[PDB]
Amino acid sequence: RHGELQYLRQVEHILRCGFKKEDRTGTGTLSVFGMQARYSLRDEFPLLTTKRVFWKGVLEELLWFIKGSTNAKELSSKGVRIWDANGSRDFLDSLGFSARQEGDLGPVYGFQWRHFGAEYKDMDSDYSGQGVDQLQKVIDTIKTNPDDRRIIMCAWNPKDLPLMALPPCHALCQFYVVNGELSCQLYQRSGDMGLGVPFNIASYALLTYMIAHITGLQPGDFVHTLGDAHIYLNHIEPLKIQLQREPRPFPKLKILRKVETIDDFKVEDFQIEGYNPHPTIMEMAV
Amino acid sequence: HGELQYLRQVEHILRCGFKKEDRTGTGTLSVFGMQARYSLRDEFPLLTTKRVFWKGVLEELLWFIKGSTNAKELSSKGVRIWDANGSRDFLDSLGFSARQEGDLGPVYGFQWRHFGAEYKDMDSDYSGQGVDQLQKVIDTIKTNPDDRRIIMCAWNPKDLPLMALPPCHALCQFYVVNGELSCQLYQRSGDMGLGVPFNIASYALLTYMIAHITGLQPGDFVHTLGDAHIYLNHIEPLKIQLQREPRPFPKLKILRKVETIDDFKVEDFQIEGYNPHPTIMEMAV
Ligand SMILES: O=C1OC(c2ccc(O)cc2)(c2ccc(O)cc2)c2ccccc21
Ligand SMILES: O=C1OC(c2ccc(O)cc2)(c2ccc(O)cc2)c2ccccc21
Ligand SMILES: O=c1ccn([C@H]2C[C@H](O)[C@@H](COP(=O)(O)O)O2)c(=O)[nH]1
Ligand SMILES: O=c1ccn([C@H]2C[C@H](O)[C@@H](COP(=O)(O)O)O2)c(=O)[nH]1
User: Fold this and answer.
1) Pairing state of beta strands B169-177 and B151-153?
2) N or C: lower Cβ tally within 10 Å for chain A?
3) How far apart are CA A215 and CA A194, in angstroms?
4) Which residues, renumbered to this chain, carry the PTM Phosphoserine (chain A)?
């Protein structure tokens, strides 16, 4: 059974049993609270095929997280503009960060991952050795104590929340080792099923591939856990069309050289093989 | 019956979990990633195939809510579940020889009411310091029930080295639709035999309290697990438990109108109709 069917079953379940729920963007949703899917990472990569996923954005965003950057312009300069609106002059001013340069998102994911608890000044400051390097801690624990049941990386920081351009969505993840296989579970508090969730799945599956490579393990499962799983009201008709498509076999992800530390990965080390998504289809809520 | 969700998770681990050694040296059968949904509508999921220590559930939660990190304050209620982790021996093993007996460091109660504050010891006055996540959750439920960010997080990487134990029930999220309040817990590690039934009751209770404070009806408790495991010396006891038919879940009654979360007391709560099967299981250390 194709792993993508779990995602399609979730979409189906929301369209059939979700409740109408108003939301921040004013678009309105159909919503279910509490969902879980399991995507195998064993000799395949769960890049969804019934609608193309912006893989270049997935990879560049994750590398940007890993170097701890909070500058939207540093991601934009790679051709990936997904964070640009949240670092714009007008958006930053609406939140009262007039003293911030354009692009300064505040202490969002990459900062929390690499420097949790350090004091947030601006995006150009030097934070070397400041705060808790959760990402390296996870990697070290996987190597020395793979049975550990507390291998956690948490972007949800209640103290830093008011400094962030947006509150963390993919809020907490946990790693797990058994039978030589590394698995990862993401707690995602809020999931745009049509446009966001496929990207999120690829993002954390990639992270698991990267950490498995660094630690000499084989990728196991990505477990995707949702809080508010929702379909925006203007996605119902496109998704009903998407749901009639049969998934194509997932692609593979190849890592093209031996990499020793998480910081040393670069875009050219990765190749998605055999990705043949169905032809395109959706308006994004703001 | 909602207890079948728990029993089916136990069965799944017994049938499909992998052997995995663990911190305690006991060894486990283990599945990574599970989820169950327990309805809170007109019933309370206090498990029946084995008696749950409801007095400990209620008193521990009230102890969380007032922000205590002192195991002696819970013990004086006749609930000793935290006493070993506050003992001198345990504190000396972690490197806390300067801390007095009972001082658990900045565990759940501190994180829930004072996230980000500087911890000193269990006797300090933390009034107004840090983020009161618990009150923030209640306020947001009242003012913006559609909010998709209603989170209380006990996992604090900065404070982890100061805690007696790393938080197990690590983060929870609340959700409102159709006048019903739901809660999802992310529990990183679940002892299915002895811990999980207590965890379910604890967060089902928390949801009843907040619904009462906010004028809403309890909806679902969604229980999400990371390492869901059965200790190897629990296998035979649990196989007995799995043959027991569940009895209908008791009801939880709140005995007066309470206005703020800090004003609940033990006397305000009554469990009606709890007829569990006889208790059975050795505790990992
Ligand atoms: O701008 C974009 O943000 C999205 C994004 C998702 C996860 C992530 O890690 C980074 C970005 C996103 C999509 C839908 C939403 O409701 C909110 C955000 C996204 C996905 C695909 C293409 C563009 C975008
Ligand atoms: O001492 C006790 O800790 C338990 C407990 C669980 C959750 C909680 O919120 C508070 C306590 C527990 C049981 C098994 C474990 O592997 C670890 C802890 C527990 C459950 C039932 C009776 C006694 C105890
Ligand atoms: O990584 C992400 C970030 C955002 N979203 C979606 C979920 C919501 O539709 C919207 C975030 O809005 P709030 O939950 O914060 O209200 O974007 C995702 O699906 N994945
Ligand atoms: O609220 C709790 C606290 C602990 N445990 C169990 C899970 C593990 O069996 C053990 C904690 O050990 P570690 O996961 O931290 O190694 O206690 C629970 O089930 N619920």
Assistant:
1) antiparallel
2) N
3) 33
4) 88
CA of B195 to the centre of ligand 2 (A): 5
Task: Give the 3-state secondary structure of residue B38.
Answer: strand
> Among all residues of chain A, which has the CA nearest to that of B38?
A34
- Technique employed here was X-ray
Alpha carbon distance B60, B82 (integer Å): 9
Q: Distance between CA B157 and CA A150 in Å, rounded? A: 11
> What does B146-187 look like in DSSP terms, one character per residue?
T-S--EEE---TTTGGGSSS--SEEEEEEEEETTEEEEEEEE
Residue nearest to atom 2 of ligand 2 (CA): B81
Q: Whose CA is nearest to atom 13 of ligand 2?
A: B195
Please state whether beta strands A170-178 and A181-192 pair in parallel, antiparallel, or not at all (unpaired).
Answer: antiparallel
User: Hey, are the CB atoms on A34 and B186 less than 8 Å from each other?
Assistant: no
How many CB atoms are located within 10 Å of the residue A125 CB?
12
CB nearest B155 (choices: A172, A179, A220): A172
Taking the CA of residue B23 as reference, the ligand 4 atom at the shortest distance is 16
Sketch out chain B's domains with CATH numbers: 1-285 (3.30.572.10)
